[PDB]
Design a protein around this ligand. Sequence first.
Ligand code: HEM
Ligand code: HEM
Lengths: 397, 388
Amino acid sequence: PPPVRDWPALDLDGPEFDPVLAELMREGPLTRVRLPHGEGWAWLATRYDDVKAITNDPRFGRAEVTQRQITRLAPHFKPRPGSLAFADQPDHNRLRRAVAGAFTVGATKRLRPRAQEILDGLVDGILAEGPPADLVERVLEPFPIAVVSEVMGVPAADRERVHSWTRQIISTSGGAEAAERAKRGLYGWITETVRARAGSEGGDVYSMLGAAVGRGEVGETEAVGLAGPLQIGGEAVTHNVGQMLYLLLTRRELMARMRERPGARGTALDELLRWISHRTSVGLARIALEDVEVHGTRIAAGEPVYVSYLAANRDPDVFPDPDRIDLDRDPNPHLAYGNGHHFCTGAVLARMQTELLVDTLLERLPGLRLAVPAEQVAWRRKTMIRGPRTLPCTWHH
Amino acid sequence: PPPVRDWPALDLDGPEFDPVLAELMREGPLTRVRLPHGEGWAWLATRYDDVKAITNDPRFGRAEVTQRQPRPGSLAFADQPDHNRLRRAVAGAFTVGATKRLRPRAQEILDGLVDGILAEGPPADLVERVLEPFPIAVVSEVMGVPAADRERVHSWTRQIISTSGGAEAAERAKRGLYGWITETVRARAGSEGGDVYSMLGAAVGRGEVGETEAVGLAGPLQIGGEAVTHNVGQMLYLLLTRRELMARMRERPGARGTALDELLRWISHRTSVGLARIALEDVEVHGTRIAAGEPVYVSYLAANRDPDVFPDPDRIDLDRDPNPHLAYGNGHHFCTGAVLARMQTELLVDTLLERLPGLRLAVPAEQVAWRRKTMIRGPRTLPCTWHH
Ligand code: HEM
Ligand code: HEM
């Protein structure tokens, strides 16, 4: 076989695709890579089809991954009971069942209005204070959160604790014991919550869950593990949209389109979604459960495999001229939200927040543009999700 | 396990001490309170000595609170040696020598304000006409605001948002004033003078503090005035409703220092405790293990009512022997304007008691409302009248 490759945790200063990934891509359909932490190496599927296929083969377990030392990108690794991330059917299915209702298309169409109201207040502020403002800390961050806390079902008196605790995201890292108590707060509060809310209607996520624990269908010890991620999830929109904006704000050709013909931002937003390198490397792996012949290659049982949707999204077979941003692509079946029964639970809710951000920010912030040079925007370092550290923008006042 | 006590805001309508705190003080030297906005609980020392120690013991930082739940260059959130470097920079325009010096100008500015009310006539609100405008002016002299930048700096600095009004608007005044300060520091970068601004820029021009920190070091100061505007506002209040006080005052001038001290120790200047301190190395207090990383508060107020130190703590004596109150903090985090506010206070009390012969409240005591939802306590207005 081909020699194992080292895939360091490099910090690109920009939206730049990962070069080493680019390399592994042209090295063959499958490659062996060694990540920063954890022992051994791991398989890597770069081709669209193999990826979609690998992510949909029942023969790949994700639970076993909680018990091994798979070569990983993160320093620490502590999976928690209830987490969908390591859920395996029938488990997974049982769990998502308890919260899925809140993220449905019908569930999100009903929120748009209340989420628009939210965003509007936020815009009301920067508009009123004046142009020199950081869209990242004034809109893009407190917004996905608030909207999610709405779906989650955080009360109105709790509306300020929860937000204030959702500082696990931070600018970068508040500190080792910093976001520690914070994550220890939200999670505590959540148990407290779920414990009450037992036996109660309301599509409210904490209600459904807490009622499910009532019926023991997802009983505690799984609660703060299932809702945990869903609560903190807004974080992704805060960085992905931060990037959509960054490209729009540094590539006049894109902003032109985005503006010269709104109500057409639909495919454009899909293009950005596909093209953007959302995370810094590869996420959680999947363990091969019984010797699979992935793209003419005997992957033995017990062996771990990863998938790079990022690279998958660049497959020339599927996306002609993959590296060019187009904004006007055909059906463009990208995979930013994942695939298989581990597809993004918030994809639909995320899109809605994305469609509000771009539309609303481009609308109320007339002639929106960077307030500093492009070289002035810094990027998050050493973290799963890639993104601008801030965004100083200005607008006609 | 001292069940965490709950210490809500304070919708107090008067100069009344805070009863919740009155209660908290009885539980014991150490207690566990929970303040409104915020997540979690914190400790609280109420006895004099403990507070005059927690505040004076290295093992409790201030900058840590900055990485928890401030702007680069805030004396408030400062540890050592950064507190000096920073304080030293501007500490000379606030010395007893710098103040005794300023006194005449301050006395003049005040007289100016007084001339105005005297002319117009008896029904007047000392607050919006004297007590409030005065400190800004006097502090701006200290800060060294160029005579042309009066109507503007004074304008902005009025982002105290009286009771409320423009919370997203006060952000503009805060961005322009702070902007303005940054410029004043860029220039004067090679200056000299008491003028805090020039004197800062001077050190800035020598990187003894570097820019950035500039706008945050003088940020508070510039605004600092209001504290005097409300503390005296209270002093007067107690004089205009508590006669025995006003009597001691009028029939024994020359001896108003003690009285001004007693007033300082009694008045509950704020609605609650200020910033907290973090136990840097996990210390203990009175057989109580304070875990490192845990927050702790101290009430100078409660500290000023300590029976051990101030016998008959709640009584307003006006003649108290030494009375080592703690109205200006303790430890390096001791008030930088303490001396500047003392002179202003004395000029206010003294001038007003002479220029406004037989000063009297023009309305009933219950007609004087108080500030709500704000850190510092005080009258919203003070309708007074005098011999015309
Ligand atoms: C548009 C921004 C977002 C992107 C690009 C994104 C992307 C992804 C990806 C790639 C995965 C993993 C798929 C796999 O394992 O193969 C995932 C999982 C997940 N995402 Fe997102 N996500 C976004 C927003 C959100 C939001 C807003 C939430 C909820 C507040 C959310 C909740 C989740 C959850 C709960 C999972 C775990 C699903 C499972 O394993 O069953 N995501 N997301
Ligand atoms: C007589 C009215 C005033 C009272 C009762 C007062 C009281 C206090 C108190 C109790 C503290 C606590 C310090 C701490 O523990 O962190 C403090 C700090 C401070 N005060 Fe005042 N103050 C007054 C007027 C002023 C004025 C007019 C200024 C500006 C010229 C000012 C500037 C400051 C500053 C800069 C600090 C922070 C000191 C540090 O942390 O090193 N104060 N004040």
